[PDB]
Symmetry: C3
Subunit: 460 residues, 3 copies
C-alpha cells in the first residue's frame, strides 16, 4: 500500500493567515468589541531606510511603466530576508507599515531576560544582511504589553498598547543607521553579563555594541532552552516550516473570524477571482492620516472604548466618502489611522473634496468622544506605492510614499486641526476661504512640503 506525497495545501484559510500574526491566528478570543488582553514580551521595531526615496524614483521614465512591479520585487526580496530571521528566531510579526515592521516575542515574565538575548542576536544578524542605498535601524523594548481588538460585525483591527510599545518607537527613532537600540526597561531587564552596550547622549536608552558570551556558552543550546517557552515554534515533523500557521486546516468558524482583518480586494485575490498583479501599483491617491491623542495612552481600559467609538464613526464616514483604513497603530502620541482614498476599485474626481469633507467630519465627531483629548488630521495627495509587502508566509497590504510621510508629519506638527498639502488644496473643488494658508514648519523627514493649509471648513 502506497504512502504518497501530501502536496502542501494552500487552502484559503492558510492564505488568510499569511496576513495575520500568531497573536490573532491562534488567539481564539471573544468577538466582543473592544476586547483587551494583557501579557509580557519583547518588541522589535525594524525600519529600512531609503525605500521612501526609491519610491519616487520608480515613477521615472527609466522604469518603463514597470515601476510598481520592480519596486515590490526589490522591496520584498529584502523584507523577506528580515522576515525569515525574525521567524527562525521565534518572533511573531505583528504588522508591516511601509518599509518597517514590528515583531513580538510574547513570553512569561521570568523568561524576558533570556528572550531579550535571543532578540538581540536576531537583530545583529538582521543588521548583518545589510552591511540600493538601504540601511536598517532597530529599536527593542520589553515589558508589559496590552492588546486591543476593535471593530464591528464584519471588520476587525488590533493594536498593541503601553509603555513598551511607546518605548520601542522612541528607541527606533533615536537609532542611527545600523544601530540596535534598547529601551531603558529592556536594558534593565536584559542579561548584562552578555550584552555589551554604549550610552546614548541625553538618553537612558542604550546602544548595542556586541554580544559577549561567556565561556561555556552555546547559542544553539541556549536557543533550544528558550523554545520551551515559545508556544508556536515549528517543531518535530513541522521543523521545516517557517510558521505553524502554514499547517492551518479549514475551519469555517476560524476563517470567518480571521477574514474580518483582511481587506475585501485581498480576499478577492485569495479567492482567485482577481489577478495577483493588480494590487501592486503606483497610483495617485489621497492619504488621510488621523491621530487621536489621549490623556493616558498606556491604559487600554481607558482608551479601548474610545478607539472603538471613534472607529465606528470613522468606518462609516470612510464608506460614504469612498476611503479605506489601510493601517492603525499607536504613535509616540496617540492612536493613528492611516486612511486612503483612490486605491484598487475606489476612484473618482472630487476624490480630493471627499477626502477633505470626510476628514472634517471625522475631526468634529472624534473631538467629542469621551477621553479623546485632541484630534489631528493630515491630508496629502500624490503618487504612492500600494501593494503586498513581506514574505510569502507573512505579508500585508501597505502603502509607501513621500505623501504618506508628509501626511503623518503634518498631523504631528500641526496638532488639533485638519491640514492639507498643496496638491489637495489646488485640486479640490472647494472655495479658497474654506482654507487658511499656514506658517511653514521645518519637519523631520520632509525636504520641501510646498505650501500647507488648514481646512477651516464651510463656516467662520
Amino acid at each position: 500500500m502506497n504512502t504518497p506525497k501530501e502536496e502542501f495545501q494552500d487552502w484559503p484559510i492558510v492564505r488568510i493567515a499569511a496576513h495575520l500574526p500568531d497573536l490573532i491566528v491562534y488567539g481564539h478570543f471573544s468577538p466582543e468589541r473592544p476586547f483587551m488582553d494583557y501579557f509580557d514580551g519583547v518588541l522589535m521595531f525594524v525600519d529600512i531606510s531609503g525605500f521612501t526615496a526609491m519610491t519616487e524614483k520608480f515613477s521615472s521614465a527609466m522604469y518603463m511603466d514597470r515601476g510598481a512591479e520592480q519596486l515590490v520585487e526589490i522591496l520584498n526580496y529584502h523584507i523577506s530576508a528580515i522576515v525569515e530571521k525574525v521567524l527562525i528566531f521565534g518572533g511573531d510579526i505583528l504588522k508591516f507599515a511601509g518599509d518597517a515592521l514590528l515583531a513580538l516575542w510574547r513570553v512569561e515574565r521570568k523568561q524576558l531576560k533570556n528572550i531579550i538575548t535571543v532578540v538581540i542576536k536576531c537583530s545583529l544578524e538582521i543588521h548583518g544582511l545589510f552591511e540600493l542605498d538601504i540601511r536598517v535601524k532597530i529599536g527593542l523594548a520589553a515589558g508589559h504589553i496590552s492588546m486591543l481588538v476593535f471593530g464591528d460585525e464584519t471588520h476587525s483591527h488590533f493594536l498593541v498598547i503601553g509603555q513598551a510599545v511607546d518605548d520601542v518607537r522612541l528607541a527606533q527613532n533615536m537609532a542611527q543607521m545600523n544601530d540596535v537600540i534598547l529601551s531603558p526597561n529592556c536594558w534593565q531587564l536584559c542579561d548584562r553579563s552578555m550584552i555589551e552596550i554604549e550610552s546614548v547622549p541625553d538618553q537612558r536608552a542604550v546602544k548595542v555594541n556586541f554580544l559577549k558570551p561567556p565561556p561555556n556558552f552555546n547559542f544553539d543550546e541556549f536557543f533550544t532552552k528558550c523554545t520551551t517557552f515559545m508556544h508556536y515554534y515549528p517543531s518535530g515533523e513541522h521543523k521545516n516550516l517557517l510558521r505553524l500557521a502554514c499547517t492551518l486546516k479549514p475551519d469555517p468558524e476560524l476563517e470567518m473570524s480571521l477574514q474580518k482583518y483582511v481587506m475585501e480586494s485581498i480576499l478577492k485575490q485569495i479567492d482567485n477571482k482577481q489577478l495577483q498583479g493588480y494590487l501592486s501599483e503606483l497610483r495617485p491617491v489621497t492619504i488621510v492620516f488621523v491621530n487621536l491623542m489621549f490623556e493616558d495612552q498606556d491604559k487600554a481600559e481607558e482608551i479601548g472604548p474610545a478607539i472603538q467609538d471613534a472607529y465606528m464613526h470613522i468606518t462609516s464616514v470612510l464608506k460614504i466618502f469612498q476611503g479605506q483604513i489601510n493601517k492603525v497603530f499607536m504613535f509616540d502620541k496617540g492612536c493613528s489611522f492611516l486612511c486612503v482614498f483612490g486605491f484598487p476599485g475606489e476612484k473618482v474626481p472630487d476624490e480630493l473634496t471627499h477626502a477633505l469633507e470626510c476628514a472634517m467630519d471625522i475631526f468634529d465627531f472624534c473631538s467629542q468622544v469621551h477621553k479623546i483629548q485632541t484630534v489631528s488630521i493630515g491630508v496629502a495627495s500624490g503618487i504612492v506605492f500600494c501593494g503586498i509587502v513581506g514574505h510569502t508566509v507573512r505579508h500585508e497590504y501597505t502603502v509607501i510614499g513621500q505623501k504618506v510621510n508628509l501626511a503623518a508629519r503634518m498631523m504631528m506638527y500641526y496638532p488639533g486641526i485638519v491640514t492639507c498639502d498643496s496638491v489637495t488644496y489646488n485640486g479640490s473643488n472647494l472655495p479658497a476661504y474654506f482654507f487658511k494658508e499656514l506658517p511653514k514648519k521645518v519637519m523631520k523627514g520632509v525636504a520641501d512640503s510646498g505650501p500647507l493649509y488648514q481646512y477651516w471648513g464651510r463656516t467662520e
Copy 2:
C-alpha cells in the same frame, strides 16, 4: 553531466484527466455511440450527510458573501481525505454527485472475493476519519457491471449499469449513519471467514460489524497480492503518486477524446483563460431533473440505444433553452439527467419559462423513444452551490443544494409528469392554467417543499 530535477508537468491532458476515472482515461474504446462493455467489479457508494443543510447556512449573512468559497474549502478538505483512501486502496473514482461519490474496483471474477476484503477495509478506515455535523454512509456491491458510453461528435458521457449498480444504491440508502452495508451478492461472494456482519431487518443486505483476520493474516502482504490484479496501481518509480494518470503525456488524439467529457467552462479554466475562482459560486439556478424508466434497466443492449436517442434530443433542446447536463446516473428506477439552467455564463430572466418549456419538450420526445416506459421530470429553482469538488488529482464539477434534492424527489414521487416548485411556478411568465396544483406528498428528505405543480402545458 548534471541530472537535474524534472518538475511535475501539469500539462492540459493531465488536468483533463483529473475529471475522469481510469475507466475512461485508459479505456481506449471505440468512438461509436452507444458503446457498451462488460466486466466485473466491486462498487463503493460513499455519501457524506449534512452538506446539503450546510449549503443553505453558507448563504447567511455570517459568511459575509464568501459562502461559496468557505463551502467548497471545507467540503473539499473532507472529500479529499476520502478520495485519498479510495485511491491508496486501489479504487477508481467514477463520479462525484454532490457530497457523494461512486468508486469501482474492476477485477477478474476469481479475484472478487479478495478485493471485497480490500474494499471493506477501505470503507472502515473511511468511516474512521469521521468519528461540521457530518456523518458518512457506505454501500458496497459486487458482481457483473456494464458500462455505456453515449454522446455525439463533441460530447461524451458514461454510465455504469446492472444489478450491482442498483444494489450499491439500495445498500447505501438503507445505511444509517456510519454503517457500511453489503449487497446480498456482495455478502454471498465475500470472504466470510473474515468479515463479521449483522443482519438488517427485512433485508437480505447485511451490515459490517468488523474484520476478523485469521492468525497469520497480514493486511499489507495481502494487499500486495491483490495489487497483481490492479492494472493502474501506482508502483515502482511512480509509487509516490496517487494516480498513474498524473504521468499522462501529451497526446492530441487522446486529449481530443477525453475533453469531450468535460464542460467547456472547465476547459477554459484548464486552459488559463479564466480565473479559478469563478466556478465556485452560490447562485440562483433552475434544476431540471429528468428520469427515464425502462422495462429492464439492467440490460445495456436494450437501454443503451434508448439513452443515446434521448440524449441526442436532450442535448439539442438544452442548447436552445440555455441549459446544461451537469451529471447523469442510474437511479433505483431509471437513467437520470441532472440539468441546470442559469450556471457560469448562461443566464436570463425567462430562465424559468425556458426551463419549463425545455422540460415539456424533453417529456414529449422521450415518452415516444422505443423502450422508454415512463418519463418523469422535476423542476426546482433556488440558490445552489456550483463548483469543483474532490481532490486535486480527482475532482468534478457538481451542484449541491436543497433544490437539487427537491427536484430529484419530485421526479421520483410524481412519476410520468413534469412537476415544478413554487418558486418556478410564481416566477415563470406563463399563465396559471398551464399548471395544476398537486396534492402534497411527504417526501424522503424534504422538510417542506411549498406548494407543487404539474406543468400541464399549453393545451387541454
Copy 3:
C-alpha cells in the same frame, strides 16, 4: 534553531530571464547602440519538421476550438525535451524560431575541438529522442562569431553574425531528416580520431555517421574536463538546476536592461496582470517579412550601423501601422525581420492595407540606408499559431504557420520588391493598379502559393 526550506523564488527577473540566453543575461555590456562583440564558439541549429503542417490541421473542426492549446502543448512537450538536452550538455539557447532553435557553446579557441565532440554527442542524443510525423534535422558550425545588439532607449534586440552563422544555416538546409551535418570549418576543427563521417555530394560539409571513442575514453570524465571552460554550467549546490539563471536575484538595473528584449504583452503576463492562456492562439494575422542584404554580411562593424539605422525607422513605422517585430535573424543572405500585424491586443480591418503601406515605407527608407544593397519584403496573411514555445526555464514568443513560411520564401524568391499573397491583395482596400500580378515560381517548401503580386505602390 530551524533551517527551513527555501521555496524556489520565481521573481519577475527570473521569469524575464527565461526569455533570454546566458549571452544576454550575464553579458553586462554597454547600453550604446549598435554594440558589437566578438568571440568563438560552436553553433547548433535544430529544426523539427512537420509542425508547420500540423498547424494547419489544428484549425480543423476535430480540435473543437482548442487547436491552439493542443498545438502548443504537443509542441512544447517535444521542444522541452530538446531544450533539456542542450542545457544539460552545456549549451546556451540563443533563440527559437517556429519549430527550430539555435544554440551556442561559447568557448576559447583552444577548446573548440573538444567542445565540438560534446555538441556532436548532444546532437546524436537529440536525434535519438525522435526515432506526430516529426523528424529532426541538425546543422553544426564552429569558428569566429560576432554579436550585434541594436535598439533604442526602451527595446533591445540581438543577433549573431559571421561565417559560422551562415554555415550553420547552410548545414541544416542540406540535412535530410535525422541527419547531423557539420560545416566545412567544423569538420576541419573537430576531433577526427573520434568522429566518423560521410561525404555529402557536391558539398564540403559532411554528415555524421557515429562516434568512435578510443579505448580508454569515458564521456563523463571528458565532459567534466570540458565543464572547466563553461562559465555558467550549474554546479555544486546548484547542480540540480537546468540554468544558473534560475538563481538570479532581484536587481532593478539588470531587470531594466533585460526587460527591453521582451514584448510588452509577455511582461504583462509575467507581472500577473493577464491570464497565461491568452497568448496561445491560432489567429488571422499578416506577416511582413523584411530582408536587408549587404555587400558583406559577415562584417559586423559594417553591417551593425546599418541594421541599427534600419531598425530605428522600422520600429517607428510599425508603431504607426500597428505591427510588431516578432523575431530578427541573419539568413543565408541578409538580416531579416519577422514582423506581425494583428497579434494579442493590436487588431483592425485595414490591417491588410496598413501592412502593405508599412511595407512600402520600410522598403523606401531602408533602400537608402548606407550599406544596405537590396531590400526585399514578403507580405502574407492567414491563420497562424502565436505562443510561447520552449521549456519552462527557456522559452520565447514565436509564430508558426504556412503563411510565415510563404512570406519568407516570397522575400527570398522575389528580391528587391515588396510582394503579397492573394489573401492580402483581395482583402486590402487598395485599388488594383497599385499591384502587379507576378509570374508563379516554384518555391522550396510551398505547395501552392495562389497568385502572388508585387505591391507597386501609389504611383507609376
